């Protein structure tokens, strides 16, 4: 996988490739790695497909139950529930998860949860096998408070490169935009992003 989440002026954007792998065989070329755990709290999934799905399903369930009793959960709270699962089951899980959400108080937030189940709040986060190839690029090109169009471009260009060098990344680039205006799904096909 290649995944990332980026905070900006109006909120946060999540991005991902669409490749699922079964060895060197591409088991799914149109995977959706960006997943909803609440109206405006989403996650990017990397690692084991089974582990990350099982985790996201449980988290969605916890937050649905949270909502019923105490109203809308914060993005921090959602990240905490992911952590609890990842940390306590670290021996049996291969899950690299980025959590991203939009509050009206807190605006956009990104929490990354690597293999051991530690939590790290960041302006943006990258992860997955393909992310190694774009640490240089992303560190050089990210700024805070970018516009929506700048942030879409940053993600598009970054994942384009990750996909170019990483054989375990590919297909389409999916993105999910999280603002006060609601939730927007974007998709970009190879013929566009490849020749960037």
């Amino acid at each position: 996988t290649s995944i990332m989440a980026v905070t900006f002026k109006d909120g946060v954007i999540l991005g991902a490739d669409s490749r699922t792998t079964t060895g060197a065989y591409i088991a799914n070329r149109v995977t959706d790695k960006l997943t909803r755990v609440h109206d405006k709290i989403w996650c990017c999934r990397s690692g084991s497909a089974a582990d990350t799905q099982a985790i996201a399903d449980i988290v969605q369930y916890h937050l649905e139950l949270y909502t019923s009793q105490y109203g809308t959960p914060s993005t921090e709270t959602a990240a905490s529930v992911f952590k609890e699962l990842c940390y306590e089951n670290k021996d049996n899980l291969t899950a690299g998860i980025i959590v991203a959400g939009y509050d009206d108080k807190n605006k956009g937030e990104v929490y990354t949860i690597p293999l051991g189940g530690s939590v790290h709040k960041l302006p943006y986060a990258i992860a997955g096998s393909g992310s190694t190839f774009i640490y240089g690029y992303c560190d050089k090109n990210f700024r805070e408070n970018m516009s929506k169009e700048e942030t879409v471009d940053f993600i598009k260009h970054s994942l384009s490169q990750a996909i170019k060098w990483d054989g375990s990344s590919g297909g389409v680039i999916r993105m999910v935009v999280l603002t006060a205006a609601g939730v927007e799904r974007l998709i970009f096909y190879p013929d566009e992003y490849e020749q960037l």
Partner: peptide
């Protein structure tokens, strides 16, 4: 198994 399917990885991401």
């Amino acid at each position: 198994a399917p990885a991401x």
